[PDB]
Scaffold this active site. Structure first.
Site, mmCIF file in Angstrom:
data_model
loop_
_atom_site.group_PDB
_atom_site.id
_atom_site.type_symbol
_atom_site.label_atom_id
_atom_site.label_comp_id
_atom_site.label_asym_id
_atom_site.label_seq_id
_atom_site.Cartn_x
_atom_site.Cartn_y
_atom_site.Cartn_z
ATOM 1 N N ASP A 1 1.020 -1.024 0.055
ATOM 2 C CA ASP A 1 -0.029 -0.046 -0.002
ATOM 3 C C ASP A 1 0.871 1.146 0.028
ATOM 4 O OD1 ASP A 1 0.252 1.015 3.025
ATOM 5 O OD2 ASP A 1 -0.080 -0.938 3.426
ATOM 6 N N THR B 1 -4.955 8.030 -0.936
ATOM 7 C CA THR B 1 -3.881 8.986 -0.450
ATOM 8 C C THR B 1 -2.849 9.171 -1.382
ATOM 9 O OG1 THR B 1 -3.007 7.938 1.075
ATOM 10 C CG2 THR B 1 -4.846 9.008 1.568
ATOM 11 N N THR B 2 -2.392 8.080 -1.993
ATOM 12 C CA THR B 2 -1.355 7.889 -2.802
ATOM 13 C C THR B 2 -1.623 8.697 -4.231
ATOM 14 O OG1 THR B 2 -0.976 5.731 -1.881
ATOM 15 C CG2 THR B 2 0.538 6.400 -3.548
ATOM 16 N N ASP C 1 -13.975 -9.256 1.274
ATOM 17 C CA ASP C 1 -13.637 -8.107 0.679
ATOM 18 C C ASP C 1 -14.408 -7.843 -0.489
ATOM 19 O OD1 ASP C 1 -11.710 -8.349 2.526
ATOM 20 O OD2 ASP C 1 -10.040 -9.127 1.185
#
Ligand code: ADP
Lengths: 476, 483, 511
Positions: free
Chosen positions: A44, A77-78, A337
């Site tokens: 991540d 956020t990346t 997920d």
């Protein structure tokens, strides 16, 4: 200065190259060698910047960039750092062409203003809840990269049935879906087709003594003449013998989360102690449950006390029977997920198709908006569009595809939609990250929230304005 | 000191690795005569690029043999040989010997010569037609001058069809190309016999002569004596009977009057190479003195006259009474650098069909037959026991580097092309080559497009390429001597 | 000396940028001048792109490619080489960051040949032929275009009077227009209003020898003798030096010397040449021979004016007087020595082959007459190309913006690798109107940003105003350029860039 700004650009240019290949589902990992010597490898990109410790004033602007995005939204956020990183590479080129940074700031703020408008003109509302179902199709694509795909419509329907039975507003007509979800467990029922969905939460505990029955249809459920007694503090052996005399099905040493889920599923409240500061009372008809049937099912090596048809449950319980340990474990996380994909889509009700379609479709509208404003704002708004095309260009490399082809096939489909609104033109098309091709996100189900793409473009543009607003360097 | 020889030949291939195929890159050629050239022909690179490393010269002498008996496959000599030695280093890393690897290639060369006839799908029809030659010469236009596939396919066909009736007499020496400054390729034409761009200096129109001979008071006295001296020379020519006089040097203003006095056609040719072409056609040589009246050094031609084609006065030297096998292709071009690049594509097309004068056999290209050839050699290498498996298996992977060059030069990924070339041949879809397209990495049938190579060319190209890799690998150390 | 791959292309890309930077500020009528010095120290101040590259002589091969491409521009068009090399290098700059992204150089050639063929089709779509628009006479509209070429110049005040001579100077010629047949001469003194236009062949006439009040100038059907022989008594080339041993023979040595000029001038009377336009000077004694023999003579003329007289009268320049006959002599109707500007001048009017003309410039300074010569020559070019090619487009950088709009809007709907390559090709076309603002001192940021806003609204003929710092309709402002020029120039530009991008390795033969 021209060389001072060049150092702030080359400084932030390398911060994005560190988390360039870490974005996406097939992103590359990197080592985090601390000062002691311990190496840490993660995939991540959000945690990479948290531990990425490099001394540069122009780089710390991007550290606080994700911290504000982590609290409000908490994802993607990346991609916010990559948008601002490429904007300054182009903005410095404007300064090389005798353009002041002030005109670039005002042009970027309007390019960000119209970007939110064009997003709002291409939003989709919460649907596929009654009358129509592609939510099956939305969840079917979520599990295409795993072995579970051999049985598509069987497990795909359990996702729609598990997300719909947990509906509850609880705040001002908000309704979202809580962080807690259905308890997924595994079994060894000799096949995968024996997986059954039950609309009631099951407690993973034993009934205690064998002489008492594993079936009870009592309404009163005492949560600490109620038969289903629950207590985490523990019940003594001589005390359980009195419940055998009373006819109750007591369970001791129960987890607080399993007791609270039952108190929430049964409508009860956890009672800590019986003594009301002066005496002793059982609190009858004060914190007891309301249920119709309670029976324990025969499960392999870990029995589950199944409660069914309460007053208000908002819960379920699925048993994953299978052939081997490998077949059941892999379908646990693929089921939990993939359920989170549709969970946020049905919650945060204003969503939009993502998958590179947002930044690519915005590169066309803002391109024409630059040719409508003028007055030292065209090249600033014009280059804001080229910065957004790097996100799908970046994923083209992470997907091991041609860097130039996927971004261009995505733009040509959106361009035909602007020429005329006929149905022949392709509308709202993304990119399939698993295969490396275009894919219609409305049919594939690649949706994203509204607060993600909107706030990312605002924070990335506002931070790039801060780095470009700097025009001096003093060292004591 | 073996790997230093491999690194030498490895670099020589990477230069022409990019000049391969129709999407190949051009080369900034700086001549030794203070001239600049720009082209993509691989044969001209080595003529100027002086590779002094003698280890790589064995590959160059093999490429020079690709000029004899054939006029195509120069990239095959440099690419297939260069890829053979690149993988040979992978074998010696494991610990293999040099003789076992050489013997494995000597066997694979025999297996490759037997699979190539099986892949011969179609060939020429042997009709001596213009549509037959133009339809098949599209392979020679490839990678020498792209874009002129329509113009040169018919232009080259017009010069060869005049000689094909002369069975067993077609040669590249019979087709001499000329180039004139002009607008572009559209003004090009084809003519019979020898045609020179220089106009006729004299006012003579037509003549059927066979004799062609290639070559204050006192102040006014010697000035007029020179006029009598020049007249005596044209009289000496009139004594011989040569009505066609080809002048190599400059002509006086009075000689133009005497050339018309005795009715002698006077033609000037300043280019020496154009004069050398007359030495081998009519028999007339260039004499150094001022017009020797030597009847022995004069040529033989049935007819000589002046023509005007494309707004350019040009002299015609054809043969009506004799059979006649000489043809001249006159091209037009504004840029002399690019105009000469077209001249080389013409010579590449003339020599392609010069080999087809033999048994006519053709093989599709574009990565179709090279993978089909590598698919069958790999089958022999899997079942053939012994230590020769490592050399024969890699000899098939050397054939893969050629379509990998066609992929990278076309901007297409090299791995994706071979993966699709092997899938279509696994199903048996032969003759399926790579489609030339910067955006489409797919493939298609090359036979339907009209792309067909020379079966007789791939034979000598695979033989000379493999024999060069043996000659370079047998030499494990280069040692200098002082005579 | 060899190198290939990605970095080799950067050496050719960054090398072509230096050639463009050397002539970047010369594009346009108000462009900056450049100074080049040879080994002799002669400094040439000029803003002509073809003369700058002809004297730079860069040894780098990549720079020599743009020179040969610009040489063809004079053949297919005639001028405008600065726009070729500048636009040729702009394609190489925008594709520079894409070469490092892993893209092959050959993929760009498939994009440029696509955009180049697309732009030529769009030129013919927007181009408008103007022959009899609103039934205004062509002589009237051409003068309106001539005043625009002389706008913002030294004669901008009385440009209405000069415009009558720009169009009339070309109208006297045949159907085939040619600038080499048009001469311009400067005369010291006089005002800007005192200028004239001579349809004949006139020369500077620096002949300052004696012979006033003689040599009757008026002739009806004179014969123009174009000689290259000096007719001075004690001439540096014609002389005699004999040494004898007899007193009476020394007189004969001056007689034989006297016969050199006398016999040579006698053949001039045998042929009947009434006007002698000679290159070398004519002495004081020979001037009186033509006076007593009822003839006229004038020497000290450059060779430029003799060739204008050669094709004007229909004769041929001969070296000596021996071959002087009617086959090389001229003929005219009116010939008279004028006193324009106080200095004496000759001009031949009424010749049969009068395919030439001369413009008399007047002014109180030599530097003012030089700039008006190129300003006037610039007005003739707009009038010249407007007659030959009636299909024109919006010049002044207006057409480059429409091409940038068409090729960009088309590339948006083109899937594949051609969007950023044709898109960058369109972004590179915006540099000509960007640099003309810099070459004229205007702020290119405010003009180009506001210029593109009008085309999005539908502006097809709006461009850069060289006079005022604003946008205006260049078609209505008589700012016209042909269609074939922009067509033949753009193809040559892509021919230069595609030829540089196609090259990947640099090879040098050691010798
Ligand atoms: N358009 C095309 N389609 C398929 N194959 C091609 C094409 N252009 C070139 N080739 C291949 O490139 C090879 C080399 O061609 P050529 O240049 O004539 O020989 P050389 O490379 O020796 O000069 C041929 O064998 C041909 O198969």
């Amino acid at each position: 200065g021209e060389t001072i700004r060049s150092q702030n650009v080359m400084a932030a240019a390398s911060i994005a190259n560190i988390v360039k290949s870490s974005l996406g589902p097939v992103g590359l990992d990197k080592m985090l060698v601390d000062d002691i010597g311990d190496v840490t490898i993660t995939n991540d990109g959000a945690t990479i910047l948290k531990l990425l410790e490099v001394e540069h004033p122009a780089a710390k602007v991007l550290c606080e960039l994700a911290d504000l995005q982590d609290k409000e939204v908490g994802d993607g956020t990346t991609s916010v750092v990559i948008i601002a990183a490429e904007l300054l590479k182009n903005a410095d080129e404007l300064v090389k062409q005798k353009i002041h940074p002030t005109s670039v700031i005002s042009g970027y703020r309007l390019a960000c203003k119209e970007a939110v408008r064009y997003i709002n003109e291409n939003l989709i509302v919460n649907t596929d809840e009654l009358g129509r179902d592609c939510l099956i199709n939305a969840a079917k694509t979520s599990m295409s990269s795993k072995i579970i795909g051999i049985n598509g419509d069987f497990f795909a329907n359990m996702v729609v049935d598990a997300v719909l039975a947990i509906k509850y507003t609880d705040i001002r007509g908000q309704p979202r879906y809580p962080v807690n979800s259905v308890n997924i467990l595994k079994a060894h029922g000799r096949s995968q087709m024996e997986s059954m969905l039950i609309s009631g939460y099951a407690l993973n505990c034993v009934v205690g003594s064998q002489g008492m029955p594993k079936r009870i249809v009592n309404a009163k459920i005492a949560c600490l003449g109620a038969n289903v007694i629950l207590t985490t503090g523990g019940i003594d052996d001589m005390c359980l013998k009195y419940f055998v005399e009373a006819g109750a099905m007591a369970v001791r040493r129960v987890l607080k989360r399993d007791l609270k889920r039952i108190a929430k599923a049964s409508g009860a409240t956890i009672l800590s102690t019986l003594a009301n500061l002066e005496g002793e009372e059982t609190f009858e008809a004060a914190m007891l449950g309301q249920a119709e049937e309670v029976v324990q099912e025969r499960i392999c090596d870990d029995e589950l006390i199944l409660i069914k048809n309460t007053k208000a449950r908002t819960s379920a319980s699925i048993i994953l029977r299978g052939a081997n340990d490998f077949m059941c474990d892999e379908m646990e996380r693929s089921l939990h997920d993939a359920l989170c994909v549709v969970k946020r889509v049905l919650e945060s009700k204003s969503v939009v198709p993502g998958g590179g379609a947002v930044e690519a479709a915005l590169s066309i509208y803002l391109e024409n908006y630059a040719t409508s404003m003028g007055s030292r704002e065209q090249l600033a708004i014009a280059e804001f569009a080229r910065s957004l095309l790097v996100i799908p260009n970046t994923l083209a490399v992470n997907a091991a595809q041609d860097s130039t082809d996927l971004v261009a096939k995505l733009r040509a489909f959106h361009n035909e939609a602007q020429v005329n609104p006929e149905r022949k033109n392709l509308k709202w098309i993304g990119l399939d990250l698993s295969n490396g091709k275009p894919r219609d996100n409305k049919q594939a189900g690649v949706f994203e929230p509204t607060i993600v793409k909107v706030k990312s473009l605002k924070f990335a543009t506002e931070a790039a304005i801060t780095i470009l607003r700097i025009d001096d360097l003093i060292k004591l | 000191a073996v790997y230093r020889n491999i690194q030498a030949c490895k670099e020589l291939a990477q230069t022409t690795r990019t000049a391969y195929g129709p999407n190949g890159m051009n080369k900034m050629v700086i001549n030794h005569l203070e001239k600049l050239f720009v082209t993509n022909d691989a044969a001209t690179i080595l003529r100027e690029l002086e590779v002094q490393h003698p280890a790589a010269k064995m590959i160059v002498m093999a490429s020079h043999m690709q000029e004899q008996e054939v006029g195509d496959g120069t990239n095959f000599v440099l690419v297939f040989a260069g890829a053979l030695l690149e993988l040979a280093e992978e074998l010696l890393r494991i610990g293999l010997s040099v003789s076992e690897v050489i013997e494995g290639y000597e066997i694979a060369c025999r297996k490759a010569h037997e699979i190539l006839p099986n892949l011969v799908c179609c060939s020429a029809k042997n009709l001596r037609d213009i549509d037959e030659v133009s339809s098949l010469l599209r392979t020679s236009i490839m990678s020498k001058q792209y874009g002129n596939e329509v113009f040169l396919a018919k232009l080259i066909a017009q010069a060869c069809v005049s000689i094909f009736p002369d069975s067993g007499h077609f040669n590249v020496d019979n087709i001499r190309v000329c180039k004139i400054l002009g607008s572009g390729i559209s003004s090009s034409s084809v003519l019979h016999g020898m045609v020179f761009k220089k106009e006729t200096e004299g006012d003579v129109t037509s003549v059927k002569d066979a004799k062609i001979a290639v070559y204050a008071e006192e102040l006014m006295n010697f000035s007029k004596g020179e006029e009598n001296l020049m007249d005596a020379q044209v009289k000496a020519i009139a004594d011989t009977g040569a009505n066609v006089v080809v002048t190599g040097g400059k002509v006086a203003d009075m000689a133009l009057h005497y050339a018309n006095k005795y009715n002698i056609m006077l033609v000037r040719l300043n280019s020496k190479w154009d004069l050398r072409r007359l030495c081998k056609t009519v028999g007339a040589t260039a004499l150094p003195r001022l017009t020797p009246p030597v009847l022995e050094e004069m040529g033989h031609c049935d007819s000589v006259y002046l023509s005007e084609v494309g707004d350019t006065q040009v002299v015609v030297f054809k043969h009506e009474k004799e059979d006649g096998a000489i043809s001249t292709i006159v091209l037009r071009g504004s840029t002399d650098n690019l105009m000469d690049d077209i001249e080389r594509a013409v010579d590449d097309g003339v020599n392609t069909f010069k080999v087809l004068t033999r048994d006519k056999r053709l093989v599709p290209g574009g990565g179709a037959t090279e993978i089909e050839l590598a698919k069958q050699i790999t089958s022999y290498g899997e079942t053939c026991p012994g230590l020769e498996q490592y050399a024969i298996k890699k000899f098939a992977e050397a054939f893969e580097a050629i379509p990998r060059a066609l992929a990278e030069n076309s901007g297409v990924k090299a791995n994706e092309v071979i993966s699709k070339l092997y899938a279509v041949h696994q199903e048996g879809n032969k003759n399926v080559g790579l489609d030339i397209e910067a955006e489409v990495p797919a493939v298609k049938d090359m036979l339907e497009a009209g792309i067909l190579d020379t079966y007789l060319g791939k034979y000598w190209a695979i033989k000379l390429a493999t024999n060069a890799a043996v000659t370079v690998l047998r030499v494990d150390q280069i040692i200098m001597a002082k005579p | 000396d060899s190198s290939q791959g990605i970095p080799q292309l950067v050496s050719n890309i960054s090398a072509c940028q230096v050639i463009a930077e050397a002539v970047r500020t010369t594009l346009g009528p108000r462009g900056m001048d450049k100074l080049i010095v040879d080994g002799r120290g002669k400094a040439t101040i000029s803003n002509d792109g073809a003369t700058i590259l002809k004297l730079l002589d860069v040894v780098h091969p990549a720079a020599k490619t743009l020179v040969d491409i610009a040489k063809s521009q004079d053949a297919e068009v005639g001028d405008g080489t600065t726009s070729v090399t500048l636009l040729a290098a702009e394609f190489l700059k925008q594709v520079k960051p894409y070469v490092e992204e892993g893209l092959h150089p050959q993929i760009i050639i498939r994009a440029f040949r696509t955009a180049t063929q697309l732009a030529v089709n769009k030129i013919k779509e927007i181009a408008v032929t103007v022959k009899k628009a609103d039934k205004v006479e062509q002589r009237k509209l051409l003068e309106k275009c001539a005043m625009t070429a002389l706008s913002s110049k030294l004669i901008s005040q009385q440009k209405a009077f000069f415009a009558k001579m720009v169009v009339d100077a070309v109208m006297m010629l045949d159907d085939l227009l040619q600038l080499k047949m048009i001469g311009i001469k400067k005369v010291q003194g006089g005002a800007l209003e005192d200028s004239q236009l001579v349809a004949g062949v006139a020369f500077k006439k620096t002949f300052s020898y004696a012979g006033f009040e003689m040599q009757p100038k008026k002739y009806h059907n004179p014969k123009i003798a174009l000689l290259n022989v000096e007719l001075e008594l004690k001439a540096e080339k014609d002389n005699a030096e004999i040494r004898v041993h007899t007193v009476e023979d020394y007189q004969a040595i001056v007689d034989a010397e006297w016969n050199i000029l006398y016999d040579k001038l006698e053949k001039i009377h045998h042929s009947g040449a009434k006007v002698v336009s000679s290159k070398l000077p004519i002495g004081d004694v020979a001037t009186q021979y033509f006076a007593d023999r009822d003839m006229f003579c004038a020497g000290r003329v450059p060779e430029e004016d003799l060739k204008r007289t050669m094709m004007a009268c229909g004769g041929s320049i001969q070296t000596s007087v021996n071959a002087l006959s009617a086959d090389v002599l001229g003929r005219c109707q009116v010939f008279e020595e004028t006193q324009i500007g106080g200095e004496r001048y000759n001009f031949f009017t009424g010749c049969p082959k009068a395919k030439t003309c001369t413009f008399i410039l007047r002014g109180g300074a030599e530097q003012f007459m030089e700039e008006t010569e190129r300003s006037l020559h610039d007005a003739i070019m707009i009038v010249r190309r407007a007659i030959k090619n009636d299909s024109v487009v919006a010049g002044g950088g207006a057409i480059e913006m429409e091409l940038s709009k068409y090729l960009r809007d088309y590339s948006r709907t083109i899937p594949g690798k051609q969007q950023l390559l044709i898109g960058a090709y369109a972004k590179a076309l915006e540099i000509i109107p960007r640099q003309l603002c810099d070459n004229a001192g205007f702020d290119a940021t405010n003009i180009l940003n506001k210029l593109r806003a009008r085309h999005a609204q539908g502006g097809t003929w709006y461009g850069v105003d060289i006079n005022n710092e604003d946008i205006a309709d260049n078609f209505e402002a008589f700012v016209w350029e042909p269609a074939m020029v922009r067509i033949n120039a753009l193809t040559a530009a892509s021919e230069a860039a595609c030829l540089i991008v196609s090259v990947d390795e640099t090879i040098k033969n050691p010798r």
